[PDB]
Design an enzyme around this catalytic site. Structure first.
Site, PDB file in Angstrom:
ATOM      1  N   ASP A 117       0.820  -1.233   0.000  1.00 29.51           N
ATOM      2  CA  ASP A 117       0.000   0.000   0.000  1.00 29.51           C
ATOM      3  C   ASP A 117       0.847   1.275   0.000  1.00 29.51           C
ATOM      4  O   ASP A 117       0.980   1.876   1.013  1.00 29.51           O
ATOM      5  CB  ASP A 117      -0.916  -0.141   1.213  1.00 29.51           C
ATOM      6  CG  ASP A 117      -1.939   0.941   1.460  1.00 29.51           C
ATOM      7  OD1 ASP A 117      -2.217   1.699   0.567  1.00 29.51           O
ATOM      8  OD2 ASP A 117      -2.466   0.944   2.544  1.00 29.51           O
ATOM      9  N   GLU A 156      -2.941  10.183  -1.126  1.00 31.85           N
ATOM     10  CA  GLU A 156      -4.121   9.328  -1.140  1.00 31.85           C
ATOM     11  C   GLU A 156      -4.660   9.105   0.277  1.00 31.85           C
ATOM     12  O   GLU A 156      -5.870   9.135   0.491  1.00 31.85           O
ATOM     13  CB  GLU A 156      -3.790   7.998  -1.791  1.00 31.85           C
ATOM     14  CG  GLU A 156      -4.979   7.099  -2.074  1.00 31.85           C
ATOM     15  CD  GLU A 156      -5.347   6.226  -0.908  1.00 31.85           C
ATOM     16  OE1 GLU A 156      -4.511   5.925  -0.020  1.00 31.85           O
ATOM     17  OE2 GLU A 156      -6.515   5.841  -0.865  1.00 31.85           O
ATOM     18  N   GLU A 157      -3.768   8.862   1.236  1.00 31.58           N
ATOM     19  CA  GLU A 157      -4.189   8.511   2.606  1.00 31.58           C
ATOM     20  C   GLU A 157      -4.755   9.676   3.432  1.00 31.58           C
ATOM     21  O   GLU A 157      -4.272  10.819   3.326  1.00 31.58           O
ATOM     22  CB  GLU A 157      -3.018   7.865   3.374  1.00 31.58           C
ATOM     23  CG  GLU A 157      -2.443   6.638   2.699  1.00 31.58           C
ATOM     24  CD  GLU A 157      -3.286   5.384   2.888  1.00 31.58           C
ATOM     25  OE1 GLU A 157      -4.490   5.447   3.247  1.00 31.58           O
ATOM     26  OE2 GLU A 157      -2.730   4.305   2.653  1.00 31.58           O
ATOM     27  N   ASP A 211      -3.704  -0.978  -6.645  1.00 33.19           N
ATOM     28  CA  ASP A 211      -3.646  -0.662  -5.212  1.00 33.19           C
ATOM     29  C   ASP A 211      -3.672  -1.927  -4.348  1.00 33.19           C
ATOM     30  O   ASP A 211      -4.431  -2.879  -4.616  1.00 33.19           O
ATOM     31  CB  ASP A 211      -4.783   0.346  -4.847  1.00 33.19           C
ATOM     32  CG  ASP A 211      -4.526   1.137  -3.532  1.00 33.19           C
ATOM     33  OD1 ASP A 211      -3.536   0.894  -2.800  1.00 33.19           O
ATOM     34  OD2 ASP A 211      -5.362   2.011  -3.222  1.00 33.19           O
ATOM     35  N   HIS A 295      -3.419  -1.547   6.598  1.00 39.20           N
ATOM     36  CA  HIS A 295      -3.252  -0.563   7.685  1.00 39.20           C
ATOM     37  C   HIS A 295      -2.775  -1.161   9.024  1.00 39.20           C
ATOM     38  O   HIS A 295      -3.138  -0.683  10.107  1.00 39.20           O
ATOM     39  CB  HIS A 295      -4.507   0.310   7.825  1.00 39.20           C
ATOM     40  CG  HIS A 295      -4.738   1.227   6.645  1.00 39.20           C
ATOM     41  ND1 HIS A 295      -5.658   2.258   6.660  1.00 39.20           N
ATOM     42  CD2 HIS A 295      -4.158   1.265   5.420  1.00 39.20           C
ATOM     43  CE1 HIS A 295      -5.638   2.890   5.496  1.00 39.20           C
ATOM     44  NE2 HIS A 295      -4.733   2.311   4.727  1.00 39.20           N
TER      45      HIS A 295
END
Ligand code: NI
EC number: 2.3.2.5
Length: 326
Positions: A117, A156-157, A211, A295
């Protein structure tokens, strides 16, 4: 309605060549990947070093490389963001766009590498550019109005709890800018006949967004009916590579089935969203379910599955070769 470009199926010879993966291919991919396996949060020195590595790698391949840099408000205050956009032939009307994000999540519990990621997708895009460089520089001279474009989005995050205002900083910003940048057919090289081009966003023929790739046995589905013809090429390519015995499996006589021959009802927020709202056709290459490591501090190098990564590389190389007729 049919896909606006006639999708000529890959000759067996070319399927076989794109599906070979030398030991030098492995080594080169892994060397590229090592550059991305570092914490790269927005604002950080390592983030800057990764952005510079992407930029240099692609200028080294004679691509046109631009940066969309801006500051944006975040729940953590003002932050600098830079999207990286590499285009093989700038003047070509239509782009096959491959994308991923290069920033990594600011994880509250500690240092987060974000190997799937998306350090892996980042390396896979550079790997594509390098392994196919000869073929791509030749395709560039055809004047056929099609080219390859690589977008590495920043930001993106989310910084805090995911929201419409705290996420997709880079993609929201780039979709907007390209929408407002007006252009027309007469300004561009060899647009397809039935084209409507009013702005730069219209030149994005399809965006293939990679992704969360690199964990063992991902499962993909068609997320968008609009791109079902393209997605089916991925299904078919994987099937042919399996027929050819070119996929690395645990035992003889297994086949990979990454690309399910179905669609799923799932809504994933990602960097495609701002382009989807502007009518860019999307192929979203993201597993469902997400890797178990998602995550967590375990989204790291050792939890990558190398045979899967090589199998995805074969698929993507044969796909780019088929789309651009390399
Ligand atoms: Ni993430």
């Amino acid at each position: 309605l049919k896909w606006p470009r006639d999708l000529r199926p890959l000759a067996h010879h070319d399927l076989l060549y794109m599906g070979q993966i030398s030991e030098e291919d492995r080594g080169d991919f892994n060397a590229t990947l090592r550059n991305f396996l570092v914490p790269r949060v927005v604002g950080s020195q390592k983030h800057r070093e990764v952005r510079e590595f992407i930029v240099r790698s692609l200028k080294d391949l004679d691509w046109d490389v631009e940066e969309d840099c801006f500051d944006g408000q975040t729940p953590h205050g003002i932050k600098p963001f830079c999207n990286v956009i590499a285009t093989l032939n700038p003047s070509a009307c239509h782009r096959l766009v491959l994308a991923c994000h290069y920033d990594s999540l600011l994880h509250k519990e500690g240092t987060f590498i974000g190997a799937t990621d998306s350090a892996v997708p980042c390396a896979q895009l550079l790997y594509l550019a390098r392994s196919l460089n000869g073929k791509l520089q030749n395709q560039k001279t055809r004047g056929d109005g099609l080219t390859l474009q690589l977008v590495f989005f920043d930001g993106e995050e989310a910084f805090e709890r995911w929201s419409s205002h705290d996420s997709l900083y880079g993609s929201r910003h780039l979709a907007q800018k390209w929408h407002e940048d007006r252009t027309s057919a007469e300004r561009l090289e060899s647009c397809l006949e039935r084209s409507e081009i009013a702005n730069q966003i219209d030149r994005m023929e399809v965006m293939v967004l990679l992704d969360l790739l690199g964990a063992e046995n991902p499962r993909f589905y068609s997320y968008f009916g609009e791109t079902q013809p393209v997605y089916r090429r991925l299904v078919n390519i994987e099937s042919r590579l399996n027929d050819a015995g070119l996929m690395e499996l645990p035992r003889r006589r297994r086949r990979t089935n990454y690309f399910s021959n179905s669609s799923t009802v799932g809504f994933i927020e990602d960097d495609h969203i701002p382009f989807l709202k502007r009518s860019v056709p999307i192929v979203h290459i993201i597993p469902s379910p997400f890797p178990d490591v998602w995550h967590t501090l375990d989204d790291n190098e050792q939890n990558l599955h190398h045979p899967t990564i090589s199998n995805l590389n074969k698929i993507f190389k044969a796909f780019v070769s088929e789309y651009l007729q390399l």
